[PDB]
Design an enzyme around this catalytic site. Structure first.
Site, mmCIF file in Angstrom:
data_model
loop_
_atom_site.group_PDB
_atom_site.id
_atom_site.type_symbol
_atom_site.label_atom_id
_atom_site.label_comp_id
_atom_site.label_asym_id
_atom_site.label_seq_id
_atom_site.Cartn_x
_atom_site.Cartn_y
_atom_site.Cartn_z
ATOM 1 N N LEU A 38 19.351 39.382 34.640
ATOM 2 C CA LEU A 38 19.354 40.893 34.639
ATOM 3 C C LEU A 38 18.451 41.343 33.343
ATOM 4 O O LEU A 38 17.940 42.406 33.600
ATOM 5 C CB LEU A 38 20.795 41.315 34.508
ATOM 6 C CG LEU A 38 21.098 42.660 34.739
ATOM 7 C CD1 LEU A 38 20.797 43.107 36.120
ATOM 8 C CD2 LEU A 38 22.416 43.172 34.249
ATOM 9 N N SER A 122 22.002 34.907 38.078
ATOM 10 C CA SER A 122 22.767 36.282 37.952
ATOM 11 C C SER A 122 22.070 37.157 38.954
ATOM 12 O O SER A 122 22.261 37.053 40.216
ATOM 13 C CB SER A 122 22.397 36.713 36.548
ATOM 14 O OG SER A 122 22.837 37.945 36.172
ATOM 15 N N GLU A 215 36.778 38.053 37.085
ATOM 16 C CA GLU A 215 36.681 36.669 37.725
ATOM 17 C C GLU A 215 37.445 36.453 38.958
ATOM 18 O O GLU A 215 37.114 35.853 39.957
ATOM 19 C CB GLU A 215 37.364 35.865 36.595
ATOM 20 C CG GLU A 215 36.624 35.537 35.247
ATOM 21 C CD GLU A 215 37.559 34.809 34.262
ATOM 22 O OE1 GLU A 215 38.889 34.670 34.435
ATOM 23 O OE2 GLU A 215 37.237 35.170 33.044
ATOM 24 N N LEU A 217 37.592 39.071 41.136
ATOM 25 C CA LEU A 217 36.635 39.577 42.110
ATOM 26 C C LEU A 217 35.699 38.601 42.409
ATOM 27 O O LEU A 217 35.004 38.358 43.699
ATOM 28 C CB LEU A 217 36.066 40.746 41.667
ATOM 29 C CG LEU A 217 36.828 42.214 41.484
ATOM 30 C CD1 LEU A 217 35.952 43.101 40.639
ATOM 31 C CD2 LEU A 217 37.486 42.721 42.664
ATOM 32 N N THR A 218 35.023 37.893 41.617
ATOM 33 C CA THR A 218 33.952 36.956 41.995
ATOM 34 C C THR A 218 34.403 35.833 42.653
ATOM 35 O O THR A 218 33.717 35.530 43.396
ATOM 36 C CB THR A 218 33.639 36.547 40.418
ATOM 37 O OG1 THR A 218 33.073 37.485 39.621
ATOM 38 C CG2 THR A 218 32.364 35.504 40.591
ATOM 39 N N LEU A 219 35.539 35.184 42.466
ATOM 40 C CA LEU A 219 36.452 34.001 43.055
ATOM 41 C C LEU A 219 36.436 34.443 44.332
ATOM 42 O O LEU A 219 35.801 33.539 45.449
ATOM 43 C CB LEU A 219 37.495 33.823 42.305
ATOM 44 C CG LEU A 219 38.260 32.467 42.182
ATOM 45 C CD1 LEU A 219 39.692 32.338 42.683
ATOM 46 C CD2 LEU A 219 37.334 31.380 43.380
ATOM 47 N N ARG A 220 36.888 35.420 44.671
ATOM 48 C CA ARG A 220 37.376 35.965 45.975
ATOM 49 C C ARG A 220 35.892 36.209 46.994
ATOM 50 O O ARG A 220 35.681 35.713 48.006
ATOM 51 C CB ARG A 220 38.086 37.185 45.926
ATOM 52 C CG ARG A 220 38.098 37.987 47.475
ATOM 53 C CD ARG A 220 38.321 39.525 47.294
ATOM 54 N NE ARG A 220 37.425 39.984 46.140
ATOM 55 C CZ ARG A 220 36.383 40.676 46.489
ATOM 56 N NH1 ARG A 220 35.991 41.028 47.621
ATOM 57 N NH2 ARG A 220 35.571 40.839 45.256
ATOM 58 N N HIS A 247 28.917 30.385 33.436
ATOM 59 C CA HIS A 247 27.798 31.508 33.648
ATOM 60 C C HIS A 247 26.902 31.557 32.608
ATOM 61 O O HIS A 247 26.837 32.533 31.911
ATOM 62 C CB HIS A 247 28.342 32.910 33.962
ATOM 63 C CG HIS A 247 27.520 33.962 34.442
#
EC number: 2.3.1.122
Length: 269
Positions: A38, A122, A215, A217-220, A247
């Site tokens: 980013l 990223s 975390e 949201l990311t996992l899902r 990360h």
């Protein structure tokens, strides 16, 4: 000493009206495109700042291409300049990566415009998958390391917009429009899974407001991507979700090294 010394090149971009710096190591007709994160700087690509990527791929039989610049660009073609932060041109990084840069490298060095790998982390993890989705001849191989795999869904357009604003004041609205704009789904790896399947893209996927919520949201999203790839008939993916993975550049490097044999076998085998 194949591909040495590492070179720093000035590659004109007609679409962006300026020269793009590119760090380059030779060593083979096919290349690994190492896309930045980013906060991409204008002097060196983050892979070279933070990792021994060039040394690790020295004598691999593969060239290594590290484009320089494009903070918050998502390596995409934007609708318009980010007016907010004074950008005086329109980012056209998809055009650069798929047309302008490969033409230059072919003409001047003999690097093949086809049969390459796109590797992103990223911000650029999704980019790599999208490049393979729409340009499979150029990229039969794509790796996404901690990428945004479903940028058009749920919280992601908001979180992406916030991240871009935090990284140089860039405006997601100028990039892909409001979240309702077709560009969001066009550039969403999850949505483009059927293309990755149809193309038989070799994909390598890694991943490691309050942090716990992010975390979750990311996992899902990551689990959904993996499940959807399988359900859609995908049979050419590597999914790496080690519990102790992070990360960060050290683990993104660990993944880059881990995939070397994989890339060699797909691109040169």
């Amino acid at each position: 000493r194949p591909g040495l010394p590492v070179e720093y090149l000035q590659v004109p971009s007609a679409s962006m009206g300026r020269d793009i710096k590119v760090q380059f190591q030779g060593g083979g007709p096919h290349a690994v495109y190492l896309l930045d994160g980013l906060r991409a700087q204008d002097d060196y690509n983050g892979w070279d700042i933070n990792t021994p990527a060039f040394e690790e791929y020295y004598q691999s039989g593969l060239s290594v291409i590290m484009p320089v610049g494009g903070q918050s660009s998502f390596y995409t073609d934007w609708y318009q300049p980010s007016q907010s932060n004074g950008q005086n041109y329109t980012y056209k990084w998809e055009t650069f990566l798929t047309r302008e840069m490969p033409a230059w490298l072919q003409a001047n060095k003999g690097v093949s415009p086809t049969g390459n790998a796109a590797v992103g982390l990223s911000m650029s993890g999704g980019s790599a998958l999208i490049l393979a989705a729409y340009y499979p001849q150029q990229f039969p191989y794509a790796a996404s390391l901690s990428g945004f795999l479903n940028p058009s869904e749920g919280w992601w357009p908001t979180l992406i917009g916030l991240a871009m604003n935090d990284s140089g004041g860039y405006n997601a609205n100028s990039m892909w429009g409001p979240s309702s704009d077709p560009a969001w789904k066009r550039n969403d790896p999850m949505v483009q899974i059927p293309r990755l399947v149809a193309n038989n893209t070799r994909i390598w996927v890694y991943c490691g407001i309050p942090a716990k919520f992010l975390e979750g949201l990311t996992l899902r999203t990551n689990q959904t991507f993996r499940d959807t790839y399988a359900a859609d008939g995908g049979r050419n993916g590597v999914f790496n979700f080690p519990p102790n993975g992070t990360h960060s550049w050290p683990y993104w490097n660990e993944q880059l090294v881990a995939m070397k044999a994989d890339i060699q076998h797909v691109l040169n085998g």
